[PDB]
UniProtKB/Swiss-Prot annotation, chain A:
Name listed for the protein in its UniProt record: Inner capsid protein VP1
Subunit structure: Homodecamer; each decamer is made up of two conformers of VP2, called VP2A and VP2B. 12 homodecamers assemble to form an icosahedral capsid.
Residues of the full protein shown: 643 to 692 of 1333
Family: Belongs to the turreted BTV-fold inner capsid family.
Function statement: Inner capsid protein that self-assembles to form an icosahedral capsid with a T=2 symmetry, which consists of 120 copies of VP2, with channels at each of its five-fold vertices. This capsid constitutes the innermost concentric layer of the viral mature particle.
Subcellular location: Virion
Domain of life (superkingdom): Viruses
Curated annotation (Swiss-Prot), chain B:
SS bond list: none
Function of the protein: Inner capsid protein that self-assembles to form an icosahedral capsid with a T=2 symmetry, which consists of 120 copies of VP2, with channels at each of its five-fold vertices. This capsid constitutes the innermost concentric layer of the viral mature particle.
Residues represented out of the complete protein: 495 to 544 of 1333
Subunit structure: Homodecamer; each decamer is made up of two conformers of VP2, called VP2A and VP2B. 12 homodecamers assemble to form an icosahedral capsid.
Protein name in the entry: Inner capsid protein VP1
Family: Belongs to the turreted BTV-fold inner capsid family.
Protein source organism: Bombyx mori cytoplasmic polyhedrosis virus
Subcellular location: Virion
UniProt feature coiled coil, ranges: none
Length: 50, 50, 292, 81, 49, 49
């Protein structure tokens, strides 16, 4: 009635990918920055997909 | 596959991975066709990330 | 389909191997009779050849009728073959390897994907026997399967220059070959050999068994030696001529030693490194079949 | 050099070295001493060096041969100097 | 330069284990603010002698 | 018997079989490709073999 299996699957997908971006070690400061900003963008794609 | 040159240095490179995942979901068949040519990209991503 | 006799296909006059020499189509044995040798202080001890890899390379999905005989012969004795491992078409032999395959090997040496009218072909059981090994020419390039390209040449020399005593012994002095020679003798020899229908000799080598096979090894030893001679000139560190009272003795040095030379020369056909890998593999498979 | 100057200066430089690594509870692992030292030595700007930085656990190994193999496959390179 | 050498060689940053002892990076690396939310702290402000 | 090579002997032969490429095979024509530059000049791996 409310849950849509597709958007939910994409939720777990973005969950995995954000966990992976977060588990990505880097040297550069800017790479550290984008490592954070990508998690936000991931979360945003998640809502858009929903 | 129209080829993608991605070294997967930046965390933002994860975009390309997601680009395939979406392609895998929205178009599973055409994906099955180009999947090895995707695997050539994803292997760079794996060797560089894991 | 050409039936295989109680002897090999080589028993047919249609498949006879000969090099042109002194104005006639001489049999290889009467060329090798001209050959003489000079032993040096260096020695050659033959080690056991490693068994060929079990794994048969997949033939790819190839619509065309691949010309496998021209590919192999030019790869070994060809005056200007290069990058022989790049196209990778030798793997196509594996298509023949299966029981009841729809493919046939033409006397032309082309591997048709299906039987076709007015094209004679070797008996598929025998060809399966031949493909079952020689498809392994397909992995000459792949790193996990490469043949040795140094030690194997010892065996080459042994089967060429080696006397029956040195051959039973398994050791010989590193002989330097020589023969009374016409202009360009080695190139013209190599081109006489390139036109050889070697698939016949290999099919008989891989399919014949017992007494028929042993009689084959005795009947064709000089043909084998001739191919070995062309290959050995390909690897010879140098090939000089010697003036000798209104005569010229061609001399290649040395038999049984692969110099791994790649830079070309007018005297003989030259191996690009790929040709070295291919030749080494071919020798591995062929000597393996030749000693059993 | 008097012992006391040498000993303590050596103690200082030995304290200075901090190899990158991942501790592990498995009883079969050994650190790839050579690769980790070479990695540190270049301030981790060599491709093998940054390979050690992003994944230090790669230095750990059981079977001695695969220790360098995993680096070759991971870097896609035919060898290392 | 020598002081900074030993310093930056100790590590630009550090974390705090469950034991509570500081463990340094051993690795020179510019601080970025994303790190502020993580387990890392800048090393100058550590006050470990 | 194999045929005698035409250069092996001094006789002149005025019919010969010249192989030649057809309109399909072409050589020396210019060739298009898609160059793609490294994303960042500083990320480029000058060093390791």
């Amino acid at each position: 009635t409310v849950t849509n299996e597709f958007a939910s699957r994409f939720r777990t997908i973005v969950a995995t990918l954000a966990n992976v971006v977060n588990e990505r070690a880097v040297q550069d400061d800017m790479q550290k920055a984008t490592r954070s900003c990508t998690k936000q963008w991931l979360r945003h794609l998640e809502t858009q997909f929903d | 596959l129209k080829k993608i040159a991605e070294s997967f240095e930046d965390p933002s490179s994860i975009v390309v991975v997601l680009e395939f995942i979406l392609f895998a979901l929205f178009f599973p068949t055409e994906f099955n066709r180009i999947k090895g040519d995707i695997q050539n990209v994803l292997l760079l991503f794996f060797s560089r990330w894991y | 389909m050409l039936q295989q006799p109680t002897g090999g296909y080589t028993t047919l006059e249609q498949f006879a191997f000969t090099i042109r020499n002194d104005g006639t189509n001489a049999t290889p044995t009467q060329f090798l009779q001209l050959l003489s040798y000079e032993a040096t202080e260096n020695e050659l001890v033959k080690k056991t050849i490693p068994t060929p890899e079990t794994h048969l390379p997949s033939a790819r999905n190839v619509p065309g009728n691949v010309y496998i005989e021209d590919a192999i012969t030019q790869a070994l004795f060809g005056i200007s073959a290069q990058n022989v491992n790049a196209h990778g078409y030798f793997s196509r032999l594996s298509a023949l390897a299966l029981p009841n395959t729809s493919a046939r090997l033409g006397l032309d040496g082309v591997i048709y994907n299906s039987e076709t009218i007015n094209i004679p072909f070797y008996d598929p059981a025998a060809v399966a026997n031949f493909a079952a090994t020689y498809a392994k020419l397909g992995n000459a390039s792949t790193p996990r399967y490469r043949a040795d390209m140094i030690d194997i040449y010892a065996h080459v020399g042994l089967e060429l220059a080696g006397t029956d005593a040195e051959r039973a012994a398994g050791v010989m002095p590193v002989k330097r070959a020589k023969f009374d020679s016409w202009e360009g003798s080695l190139i013209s020899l190599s081109r006489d050999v390139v036109n050889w229908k070697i698939l016949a000799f290999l099919i008989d080598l891989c399919s014949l068994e017992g007494e028929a096979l042993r009689a084959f090894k005795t009947r064709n030893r000089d043909v084998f030696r001739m191919m070995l001679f062309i290959m050995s000139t390909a690897v010879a560190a140098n090939v000089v001529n010697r003036k000798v009272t209104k005569r010229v003795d061609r001399v290649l040095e040395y038999i049984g030693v692969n110099s791994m030379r790649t830079a070309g020369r007018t005297a003989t056909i030259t191996y690009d490194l790929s040709r070295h890998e291919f030749a080494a593999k071919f020798l591995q498979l062929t000597f393996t079949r030749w000693n059993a | 050099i008097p012992a006391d100057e040498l000993i303590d200066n050596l103690h200082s430089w030995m304290r200075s070295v901090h190899l990158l690594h991942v501790r592990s509870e498995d009883n079969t692992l050994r650190y790839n001493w050579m690769l980790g030292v070479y990695a540190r030595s270049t301030n981790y700007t060599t491709p093998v060096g940054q390979l050690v930085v992003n994944a230090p656990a790669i230095l750990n190994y059981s079977n001695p041969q695969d220790a360098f193999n995993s680096v070759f496959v991971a870097l896609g390179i035919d060898y290392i100097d | 330069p020598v002081e900074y050498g030993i310093f930056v060689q100790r590590g630009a940053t550090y974390t705090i284990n469950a034991a509570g002892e500081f463990e340094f990076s051993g690795r020179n690396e510019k601080w970025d603010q994303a790190l502020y939310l993580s387990e890392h702290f800048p090393a100058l402000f550590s006050d470990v002698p | 018997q194999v045929g005698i090579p035409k250069l092996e002997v001094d006789h002149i032969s005025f019919s010969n079989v010249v192989s030649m490429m057809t309109a399909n095979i072409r050589t020396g024509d210019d060739m298009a490709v898609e160059r793609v530059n490294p994303d960042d000049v500083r990320a480029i791996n000058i060093r390791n073999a």
